[PDB]
């Protein structure tokens, strides 16, 4: 006896959570862009030490 109400509250819940999932992917890739393009160089020192 909850069939009609249940299917309408699930439309609200699935729309909200689907957009939060796409927004979370955007925000992550922005805050991770420094680490992904960081670069390293090596110059062998003198083994005096």
């Amino acid at each position: 006896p909850e069939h009609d109400e249940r299917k309408r509250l699930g439309l609200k819940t699935v729309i909200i959570l689907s957009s939060l999932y796409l927004l979370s992917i955007w925000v992550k890739k922005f805050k991770w862009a420094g680490i992904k393009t960081r670069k390293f160089v090596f110059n062998p020192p003198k083994p005096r030490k």
Partner: protein, 431 residues
């Protein structure tokens, strides 16, 4: 206490001081390390040392003449000093050995001997002078791929492939009358220097120096030079600041004076009226720091440098310092502004009224090359006393609040955290 400029095709500036015991005369050019390219970087540092080599300093010493020179990013200098009644001999030496004849100075033996010494100077700098090489690295990450990135001493790799032809080419392009100022400081009168010049004719070259394709641009970035065998960590951090000939020139200098400079081992430096010191001294997170506001023709930098032996609490040092900066937008008081006013006046009052005429000549020539005129010290004081709290908050809200940063560091910097945790401290999130 007033400077006098005339023009004949040759600009001649002078700050006469009758109560001095020496006189300095020289020529300043308006090209520096920010007027060369990555291939010929250091050609100006090699021009300075050809001027100061032995057989040219010997010829001056027999006449009673001392020599000096300086390389910067916007200008170069070649100065001669003497006793007050010997200034016409100073001008002759500057005429003969420098502007007209230089085949004597660019010989094959003097060039190799000079290159050997300069390479040893630069190699020594890069292995032992840690606070100054980190500030040079800051300039190179902030202004990367622009002319304001190149180091003033040159780089050990570019300095090895220079020949005499590189010197002669650079001279023909930049040592020109249109790009030159003749200066005179100490016990020297303006009319006598003008008369001595027109008795000769005294012109170097005509003009038309090259225009620089790219303009300077700031970029937020970092460069880390990790060395675990050194006993400290050296760090410098800045934002984009004000250039010369800006309306906010003195307001940025006052803001740097609010946080000031510190030495942990001096007793009186621990008692300064700076609220940042209430946070560092309880666990002693640093040995020293200093706040700067550097200004050039195209851009500037505003920030601080520090050295520390407490390598496990670096993140507390950077955090507490950046939170104090936030207060310039939100809660700076009137007492902090009235203190920085009078200490800024004492600072630049000692820079512009020292006793050395050599420093006077470098300052005068660099200012007249940009503005065409020198602002007196009585005028600069009136601009400083007219600054209010509102001017500071308006400047900081535009230059500091949630803005990108540049960072450089060397030594034991494991405890220096990533870029974005430091960038996030530029806004408070409690306002």
């Amino acid at each position: 206490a007033e400077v006098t400029q005339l023009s004949n095709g040759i600009v001649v500036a002078t700050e006469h001081n009758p109560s001095a015991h020496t006189a300095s005369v020289g020529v300043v050019f308006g090209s520096g390390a920010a007027n060369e390219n990555p291939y010929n970087n250091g050609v100006s540092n090699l021009w300075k040392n050809i001027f100061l080599s032995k057989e040219n300093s010997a010829v001056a010493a027999k006449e009673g003449l001392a020599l000096s020179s300086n390389i910067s990013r916007d200008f170069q200098s070649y100065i001669v000093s003497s006793l007050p009644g010997s200034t016409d001999k100073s001008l002759d030496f500057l005429n003969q050995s420098f502007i007209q004849q230089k085949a004597n100075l660019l010989s094959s033996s003097n060039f190799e001997a000079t290159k050997k010494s300069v390479l040893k100077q630069v190699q020594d700098f890069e292995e032992n002078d840690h606070p100054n090489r980190v500030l040079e690295h800051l300039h190179s990450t902030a202004f990367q791929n622009t002319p304001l990135s190149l180091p003033t001493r040159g780089t050990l790799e570019s300095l090895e492939n220079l020949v005499v032809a590189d010197l002669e080419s650079f001279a023909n392009n930049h040592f020109l009358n249109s790009n030159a100022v003749v200066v005179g400081t100490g016990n020297i009168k303006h009319e006598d220097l003008v008369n001595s010049i027109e008795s000769k004719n005294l012109s170097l070259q005509t003009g038309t120096k090259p225009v620089l394709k790219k303009k300077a641009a700031f970029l937020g970035s970092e460069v880390r030079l990790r060395d675990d065998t050194l006993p400290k960590a050296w760090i410098s951090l800045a934002v984009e600041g004000e250039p010369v000939n800006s309306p906010n020139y003195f307001v940025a200098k006052l803001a740097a004076q609010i946080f000031g400079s510190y030495n942990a081992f001096e007793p009186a430096s621990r008692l300064q009226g700076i609220k940042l010191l209430d946070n560092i001294q309880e666990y002693q997170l640093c040995d020293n720091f200093n706040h700067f506001s550097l200004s050039y023709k195209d851009s500037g930098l505003w920030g601080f440098s520090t050295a520390t032996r407490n390598v496990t609490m670096i993140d507390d040092l950077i955090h507490f310092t950046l939170k104090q900066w936030n207060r310039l937008t939100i809660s700076v008081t009137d007492t902090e502004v009235e203190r920085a006013k009078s200490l800024l006046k004492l600072q630049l009052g000692q820079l512009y009224e020292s006793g050395n005429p050599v420093n006077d000549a470098n300052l005068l020539g660099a200012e007249v090359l940009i503005k065409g005129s020198k602002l007196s010290l009585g005028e600069a004081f009136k601009k400083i006393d007219a600054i209010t709290v509102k001017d500071v908050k308006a400047w900081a809200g535009k230059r500091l609040w949630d803005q990108d940063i540049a960072i450089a560091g060397t030594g034991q910097i494991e405890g220096l955290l990533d870029y974005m945790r430091i960038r996030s401290d530029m806004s408070m999130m409690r306002w």
